[PDB]
mmCIF file of C-alpha atoms in Angstrom:
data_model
loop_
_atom_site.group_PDB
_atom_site.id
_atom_site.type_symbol
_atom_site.label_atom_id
_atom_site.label_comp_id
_atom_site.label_asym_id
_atom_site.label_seq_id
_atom_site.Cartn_x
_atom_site.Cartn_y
_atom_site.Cartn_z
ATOM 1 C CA UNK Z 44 -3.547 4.924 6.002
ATOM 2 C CA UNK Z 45 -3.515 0.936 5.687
ATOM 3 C CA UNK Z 46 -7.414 1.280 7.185
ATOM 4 C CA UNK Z 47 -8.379 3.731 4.134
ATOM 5 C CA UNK Z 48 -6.286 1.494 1.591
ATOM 6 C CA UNK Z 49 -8.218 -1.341 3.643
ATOM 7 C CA UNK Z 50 -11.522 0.456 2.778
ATOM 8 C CA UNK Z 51 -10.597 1.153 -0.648
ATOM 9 C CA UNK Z 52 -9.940 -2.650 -1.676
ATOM 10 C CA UNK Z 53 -13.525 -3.564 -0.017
ATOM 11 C CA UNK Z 54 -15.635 -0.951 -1.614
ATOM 12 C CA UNK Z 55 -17.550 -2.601 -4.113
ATOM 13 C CA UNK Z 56 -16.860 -1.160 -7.495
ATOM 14 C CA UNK Z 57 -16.453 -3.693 -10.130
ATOM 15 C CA UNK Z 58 -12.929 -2.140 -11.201
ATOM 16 C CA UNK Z 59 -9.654 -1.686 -9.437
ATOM 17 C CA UNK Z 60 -8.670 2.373 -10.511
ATOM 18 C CA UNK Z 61 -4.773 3.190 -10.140
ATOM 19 C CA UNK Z 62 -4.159 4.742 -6.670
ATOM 20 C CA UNK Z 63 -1.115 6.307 -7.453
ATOM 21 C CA UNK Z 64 -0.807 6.772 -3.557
ATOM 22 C CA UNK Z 65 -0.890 2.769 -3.080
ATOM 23 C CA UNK Z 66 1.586 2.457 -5.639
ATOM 24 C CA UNK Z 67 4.012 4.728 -3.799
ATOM 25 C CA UNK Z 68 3.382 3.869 -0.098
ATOM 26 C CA UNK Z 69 3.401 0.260 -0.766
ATOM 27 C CA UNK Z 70 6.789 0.970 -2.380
ATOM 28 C CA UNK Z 71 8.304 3.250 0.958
ATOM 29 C CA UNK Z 72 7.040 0.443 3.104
ATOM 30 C CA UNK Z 73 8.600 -2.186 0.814
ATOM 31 C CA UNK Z 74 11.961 -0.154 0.747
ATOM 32 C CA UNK Z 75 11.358 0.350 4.707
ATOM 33 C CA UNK Z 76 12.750 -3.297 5.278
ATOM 34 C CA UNK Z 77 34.266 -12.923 13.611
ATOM 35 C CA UNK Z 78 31.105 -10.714 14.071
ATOM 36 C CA UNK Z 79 29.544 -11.866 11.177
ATOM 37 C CA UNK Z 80 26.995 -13.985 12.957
#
């Protein structure tokens, strides 16, 4: 997934599009991250 979104940034196209898959994956993966010590 992170290769094709890897692909996706490199491909020469003169304009990002929207990648509404990006925009949710990157958001699962950023919501997938005296005893106190």
């Amino acid at each position: 997934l992170i290769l094709l979104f890897s692909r996706t940034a490199l491909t020469e196209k003169c304009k990002l599009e929207e990648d509404f898959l990006y925009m949710a994956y990157a958001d699962i993966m950023a919501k997938s991250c005296v005893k106190s010590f």
